[PDB]
């Protein structure tokens, strides 16, 4: 007779940028592009349908960590845009724009592009009674951080208070984090660290930030949408071609009702299956 095989056991090996806008985050994570690492501020205000994370991704700005990291990174991957809108906060007496050589931006000191590291001004650090309202028609994602110094002397030298605090409030949200002082091992030098937390705002609601020290301020917000975007970890090269679904092993033909190459897919694809072969008689 003849036969139909139904399990797509073969991929193209390359990711095809049509019909999906494929954004290759070459040397960074989605978070690095989200935070504003200087070597990936090239991804500023980028939009996508599938972000591709490569294995050699890396970070060069201040050593940090994200509690609930996978939730954050895929929260931005689902809106599919890094559209950042500066909001011009007023930081009275606390010296914005702190940077260091771990994050060398340009000739010297730099910091996260979308983050505002505050210090003391003069020799003080007052408690910040800030406010910023979201009165528009869309939800705001605020990315903010805290500094975990490396010694009690570091805490005093920059945030004169013996113990600092940050409190990012809404009418629905409240998060109060305290910096635990400790000298971590060296990562890109420094023994101090930064931990990243985020605060979504929905329309009408207000975001207020109370802090006696260690605050890593935000500069603005990312406009958030609802769409078909996502992210992918892959080392498959990108070519200009056509395929409607993509796997970490490169694109797939959507010819066959089933597929064997990978469980991870994007778009209208066949359903992942364990089979190695399935021939239907014709």
């Amino acid at each position: 007779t003849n036969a139909t095989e139904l399990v797509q056991s073969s991929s193209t090996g390359k990711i095809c940028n049509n019909p999906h806008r494929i954004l290759d985050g070459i040397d960074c994570t989605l978070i690095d592009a989200l935070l504003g690492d200087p070597h990936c501020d090239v991804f500023q205000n980028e939009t996508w349908d599938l972000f591709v994370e490569r294995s050699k991704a890396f970070s060069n700005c201040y050593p940090y960590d994200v509690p609930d990291y996978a939730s954050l990174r895929s929260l931005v991957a689902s809106s599919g845009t890094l559209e950042f809108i500066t909001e011009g906060f007023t930081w009275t007496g606390v010296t914005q724009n702190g940077g260091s050589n771990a994050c060398k931006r340009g000739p010297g000191s730099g910091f996260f592009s979308r983050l505002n590291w505050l210090t003391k001004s003069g020799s003080t650090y007052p408690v910040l009674n800030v406010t910023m309202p979201n009165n528009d028609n869309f939800d705001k994602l605020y990315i903010w951080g805290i500094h975990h110094p490396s010694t009690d002397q570091e805490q005093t030298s920059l945030y004169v208070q013996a113990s600092g605090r940050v409190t990012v409030s809404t009418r629905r949200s409240q998060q109060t984090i305290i910096p635990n002082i400790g000298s971590r091992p060296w990562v890109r030098g420094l023994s101090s660290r930064i931990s990243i937390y985020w605060t979504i705002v929905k329309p009408g609601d207000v975001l207020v930030i109370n802090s006696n020290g260690n605050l890593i301020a935000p500069r603005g917000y990312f406009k958030m949408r609802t769409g078909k975007s996502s992210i992918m970890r892959s080392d498959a090269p990108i070519d200009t071609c056509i395929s409607e679904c993509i796997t970490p092993n490169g694109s797939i033909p959507n010819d066959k009702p089933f597929q064997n190459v990978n469980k991870i897919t994007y778009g209208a694809c066949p359903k992942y299956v364990k089979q190695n072969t399935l021939k239907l008689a014709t």
Partner: antibody
Amino acid sequence: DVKLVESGEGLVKPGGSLKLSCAASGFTFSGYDMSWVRQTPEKRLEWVAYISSGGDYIYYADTVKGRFTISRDNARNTLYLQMSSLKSEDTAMYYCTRDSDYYGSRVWFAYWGQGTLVTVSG
Amino acid sequence: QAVVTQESALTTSPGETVTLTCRSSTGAVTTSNYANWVQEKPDHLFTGLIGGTNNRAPGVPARFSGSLIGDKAALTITGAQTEDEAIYFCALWFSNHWVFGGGTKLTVLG
């Protein structure tokens, strides 16, 4: 597929000196951070030096301070350690280490070189 | 001070559960010491296995586990294999220093 390959093993007299190189391959830098660690003939492990992208923030084995210097060649992707005024106590096989990965891993000393032998002789 | 210590040698069987340990001389071992475990297979083939108190390196199978049992650091191999016959050193972070233990020789039978 990361690999670190060393060179420069050779015999030296006391107070003498040696320079060592470890050719790094398979990854984007010469190293994200890199460090030198030696194991004595008594098979004890002592960390020697450490580097940033450009050597930020304490990297000193106080027993080798003033005697060694660690360098990296960002262009040719090479790591260097030149030790001078050598002592008996420095006779070891020095290992080329690149400290481990991102937030998820952050394991120090995952990737190592196969080591090259330094003998402070007489 | 800063002298890190561990058992000289251990011996076990495949399928069994092992637990190598690492102690401080500065007192109690905390997460703030960031216990790091590197495995040397012979002819100087080192591999970092566990760092960051429990954090497992990418290629390391889940059978290896690091923990704190009491005031000690520890490395447990639940489901030991002949693959695990090696020498396992340990390193703890004292803020100024950065030190290794003598290393434990693991002798798997079978």
